[PDB]
Amino acid sequence: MLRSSLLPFSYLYEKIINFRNTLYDKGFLKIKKLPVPVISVGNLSVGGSGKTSFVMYLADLLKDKRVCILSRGYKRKSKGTLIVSEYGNLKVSWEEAGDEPYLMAKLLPHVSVVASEDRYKGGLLALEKLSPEVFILDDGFQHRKLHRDLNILLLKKKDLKDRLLPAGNLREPLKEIRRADALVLTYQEVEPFEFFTGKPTFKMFREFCCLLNSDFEEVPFDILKEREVIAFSGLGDNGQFRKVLKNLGIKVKEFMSFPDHYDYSDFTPEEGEIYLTTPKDLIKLQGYENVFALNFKVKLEREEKLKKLIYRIFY
Numbered sequence: 001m002l003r004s005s006l007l008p009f010s011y012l013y014e015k016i017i018n019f020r021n022t023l024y025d026k027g028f029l030k031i032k033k034l035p036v037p038v039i040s041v042g043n044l045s046v047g048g049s050g051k052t053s054f055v056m057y058l059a060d061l062l063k064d065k066r067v068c069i070l071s072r073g074y075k076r077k078s079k080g081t082l083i084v085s086e087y088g089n090l091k092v093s094w095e096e097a098g099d100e101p102y103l104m105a106k107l108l109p110h111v112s113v114v115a116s117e118d119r120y121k122g123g124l125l126a127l128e129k130l131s132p133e134v135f136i137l138d139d140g141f142q143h144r145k146l147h148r149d150l151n152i153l154l155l156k157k158k159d160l161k162d163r164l165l166p167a168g169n170l171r172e173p174l175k176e177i178r179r180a181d182a183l184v185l186t187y188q189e190v191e192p193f194e195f196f197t198g199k200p201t202f203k204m205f206r207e208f209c210c211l212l213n214s215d216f217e218e219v220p221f222d223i224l225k226e227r228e229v230i231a232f233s234g235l236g237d238n239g240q241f242r243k244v245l246k247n248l249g250i251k252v253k254e255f256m257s258f259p260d261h262y263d264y265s266d267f268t269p270e271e272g273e274i275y276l277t278t279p280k281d282l283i284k285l286q287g288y289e290n291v292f293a294l295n296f297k298v299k300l301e302r303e304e305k306l307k308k309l310i311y312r313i314f315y
């Protein structure tokens with residue numbers, strides 16, 4: 001009965017969140033405008049809702065534009081505004097960038113990535129140094145201080161039954177779905193679901209494509225043919241990763257579980273063996289040419305309307 005014990009904090013947190021949102025709604029707090037288009041990707045949950053996949057998909061749609069991701073870079077022990085990546089060129093290590101913005105830069109070698117708590121300041125720096133044509137906020141639904149021309153909200157079925165922090169995982173009450181210009185329905189593979197709001201709505205799917213090597217280049221799945229791999233990941237990821245490796249038919253001779261906080265500073269792989277791990281782990285192991293991650297293609301069902309919305313923000 002522990003969870004219900006946190007409900008009083010949830011109701012309190014609701015008042016705090018609703019007040020802030022009301023101030024934004026009614027024009028009491030400033031909303032700043034960058035002089036090029038801004039697309040926000042977001043979610044209502046503190047848990048994952050497929051954002052990295054959707055940013056990959058979104059960047060691919062925008063492959064003919066100069067793209068810059070504006071990330072919070074929340075973890076990082078350093079602060080201020082920081083260029084992590086210039087169109088694929090990493091400017092800092094993962095330690096300094098934080099895991100997540102560094103990983104996004106590796107997953108998207110054609111886009112820039114800027115880490116900045118204040119997204120607007122991030123954009124200004126990018127404008128001066130990188131001359132991008134469009135910004136993507138990878139987690140910007142609540143960052144209402146920055147105007148976005150297209151507000152995309154990711155929603156998984158589980159969100160619809162959740163409750164506010166700290167009793168549940170929601171950062172905001174479900175009514176705030178109203179702020180979205182478009183919904184992307186995620187986690188379809190494990191929990192398929194429909195949701196009608198009248199808003200433009202798109203189901204997202206992932207499909208296995210290839211391995212990623214330690215340099216994050218795409219390499220064929222073929223190399224696993226008649227090989228048994230050693231797989232490893234952080235403590236929590238162990239579950240999802242295992243299930244996925246099995247359903248893909250990947251032969252695993254041994255699995256290893258490390259703590260979620262591992263910098264792999266003591267990791268010693270065996271020459272001649274092939275390793276599979278998560279992209280979040282892979283970033284700490286570049287150079288090891290026998291360590292790979294799985295790469296998935298990202299697709300949106302009936303995407304045409306989404307493309308139209310994106311097209312129209314460049315006027």
Ligand SMILES: Nc1ncnc2c1ncn2[C@@H]1O[C@H](COP(=O)(O)OP(=O)(O)OP(=O)(O)O)[C@@H](O)[C@H]1O
Nearest residue numbers: 048049050051052053056279280294295296297298
């Ligand atoms: N299309 C993809 N190909 C390869 N790796 C991916 C892809 N999309 C995401 N990843 C990596 O795999 C992890 C799991 O993906 P998934 O979307 O199931 O989890 P999530 O926690 O909802 O995602 P996120 O970390 O973006 O919030 C992500 O955290 C990211 O590191």
